C-alpha cells in the first residue's frame, strides 16, 4: 500500500542531462550508459516506514543496494545505514536524492558531473547539497 509520493517498484534511473542514458553498475562504480534493456538498468525502489526513506536495489543483483563509500563515490553494496535515500521531488518524476544521514554535518546528494551536458563515463558521486537548483543533482525516476 502507498505511504508516500513515490510508489514501490522497478524504475529506470536517468540524469536530466540525457534521456537516453541509464544508471547501471560498471565495475564498482555507477554510471549512465546506453539503453541495454537488461536488468542491471532496473532499480527496485522500496519505502521504509520506520525512517521514512527509500532503499534502492539493483534488479540483476537484488541483495545489493545503492550506497556510498569513503571516497565520495556512490556504490552497490549490502544493506546498511548508507543505503537509505531521502528524495526531494522537484518536478513530475525528477528528484534530488539526499543521503538520509548528514555527512560532514551537511546534506549530501547524488551528483553527476557534466562537461557541457555530457555525462558519458562519469561515475555517480555523493557531494554536498545546498538547494534544489543544482542540475548535476537532478535525476529522473521512470517507472518501467
Amino acid at each position: 500500500v502507498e505511504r508516500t509520493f513515490l510508489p514501490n517498484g522497478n524504475y529506470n534511473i536517468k540524469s536530466i542531462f540525457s534521456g537516453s542514458l541509464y544508471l547501471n553498475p560498471v565495475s564498482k562504480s555507477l554510471t549512465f550508459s546506453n539503453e541495454s534493456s537488461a536488468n542491471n538498468q532496473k532499480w527496485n525502489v522500496e519505502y521504509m516506514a520506520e525512517n521514512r526513506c527509500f532503499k534502492i536495489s539493483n534488479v540483476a543483483e537484488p541483495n545489493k543496494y545503492l550506497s556510498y563509500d569513503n571516497f565520495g563515490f556512490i556504490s552497490l553494496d549490502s544493506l546498511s545505514n548508507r543505503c537509505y535515500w531521502f528524495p526531494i521531488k522537484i518536478a513530475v518524476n525528477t528528484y534530488i536524492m539526499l543521503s538520509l544521514n548528514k555527512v560532514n554535518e551537511l546534506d549530501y546528494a547524488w551528483d553527476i558531473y557534466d562537461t557541457n551536458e555530457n555525462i558519458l563515463s562519469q561515475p555517480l558521486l555523493l557531494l554536498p547539497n545546498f538547494d534544489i537548483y543544482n542540475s548535476n543533482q537532478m535525476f529522473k525516476l521512470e517507472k518501467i
Partner: protein, 286 residues
C-alpha cells in the same frame, strides 16, 4: 611559510577587475580600491596546513573569511580559529591562480558569482569562477598604475621627463603634463618594476650607469638592462611613501640632488642612506 603573514589582494580569474572586498562582516566582489578594504593577511597554521584569511579592516581588526555552514554563503566573522575559518590555498601551477578550498570541508571551494558580485562555496569544475589571483598588495596596487612621483621634501613638485625629445629627468612644479606622469609595470620574471613615462610609448626610467649617477628616460627595447628596472619598497607607517632602488645595484637609490627642491633640480641615483631626499610619494594624478 612563503605566504604566512603576507598581506595580499585577491581578485577573480573570471574577472580580473573584481577584488575580494570587506566591510562590516560582508564580503563582496568590487572594483580595485587600492586600500585596506581589499587587503587580507594570510595566517598559516602548520598543524592544519591551512590558512586564515584575515581582513585588514581598520575598525574591526579580528574579522576572518568564514564559511557559514551549512549554507553555501561566505562572510567575515570574529576569529575564533574555527575549522570553517580555515582555507587550503592550492596553486594551479602554470595557470598562476589559486583554488581556495574549505579546510572544514575540502569538497567545497570558493566560487566567484560575478553577476551577484559575491562569493559562495561550490563543488569543483574547470571554469575560472573557482580560480583566484593572490598577489602582494603593493604589487597589486602599483602594477599598471599611472601615477605622479613627488619627493616628500616638496609634494608640489614632481619627477618629470623634460619633454618628448629631451629625455633628461628633473624635479619640476606639477602642471598635469603627460611628461610628469608615469605608468608602473611589474615584471614577474625579474621581480622588479619599470616606470614608463606617459609622453612616450616605450620610454622607461633608467640609471645611465655609463655616466656615474645620472638617471634618464631611455627606450625599453633594450631588454637585458637591469638598470631599467627598480625595486619599490614601502616606508613604514605611510600609505604612499616609497624608497626606489635600482635592480642592477640595489645599494643605488633614487635620489633628489642635495635634497634641493628648486625647479630643474637633478633626479639621480645615489648610495642608499634612507634620508628624506631618497623618499618618494607615488600618487594618483588629481
Amino acid at each position: 611559510n612563503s605566504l604566512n603573514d603576507k598581506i595580499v589582494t585577491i581578485s577573480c580569474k573570471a574577472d580580473t577587475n573584481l577584488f575580494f572586498y570587506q566591510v562590516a562582516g560582508n564580503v563582496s566582489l568590487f572594483q580595485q580600491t587600492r586600500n585596506y578594504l581589499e587587503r587580507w593577511r594570510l595566517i598559516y597554521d602548520s598543524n592544519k596546513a591551512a590558512y586564515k584569511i584575515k581582513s585588514m579592516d581598520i575598525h574591526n581588526t579580528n574579522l576572518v573569511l568564514t564559511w557559514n555552514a551549512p549554507t553555501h554563503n561566505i562572510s567575515t566573522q570574529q576569529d575564533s580559529n574555527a575549522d570553517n575559518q580555515y582555507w587550503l590555498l592550492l596553486k594551479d601551477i602554470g595557470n598562476n591562480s589559486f583554488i581556495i578550498a574549505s579546510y572544514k570541508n575540502p569538497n567545497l571551494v570558493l566560487y566567484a558569482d560575478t553577476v551577484a558580485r559575491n562569493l559562495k562555496l561550490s563543488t569543483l569544475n574547470n571554469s575560472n569562477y573557482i580560480k583566484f589571483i593572490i598577489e602582494d598588495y603593493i604589487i597589486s596596487d602599483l602594477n599598471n598604475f599611472t601615477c605622479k612621483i613627488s619627493p616628500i621634501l616638496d609634494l608640489n613638485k614632481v619627477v618629470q621627463q623634460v619633454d618628448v625629445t629631451n629625455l633628461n629627468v628633473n624635479l619640476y612644479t606639477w602642471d598635469y603634463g603627460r611628461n610628469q606622469k608615469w605608468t608602473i609595470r611589474y615584471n614577474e620574471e625579474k621581480a622588479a618594476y619599470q616606470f614608463f613615462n606617459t609622453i612616450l610609448s616605450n620610454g622607461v626610467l633608467t640609471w645611465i650607469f655609463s655616466n656615474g649617477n645620472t638617471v634618464r628616460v631611455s627606450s625599453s627595447n633594450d631588454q637585458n638592462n637591469d638598470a631599467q628596472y627598480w625595486l619599490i619598497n614601502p616606508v613604514s607607517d605611510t600609505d604612499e611613501t616609497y624608497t626606489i632602488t635600482n635592480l642592477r645595484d640595489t645599494t643605488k637609490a633614487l635620489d633628489l640632488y642635495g635634497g634641493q627642491t628648486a625647479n630643474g633640480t637633478a633626479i639621480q641615483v645615489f648610495n642608499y642612506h634612507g634620508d628624506d631626499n631618497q623618499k618618494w610619494n607615488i600618487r594618483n594624478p588629481p
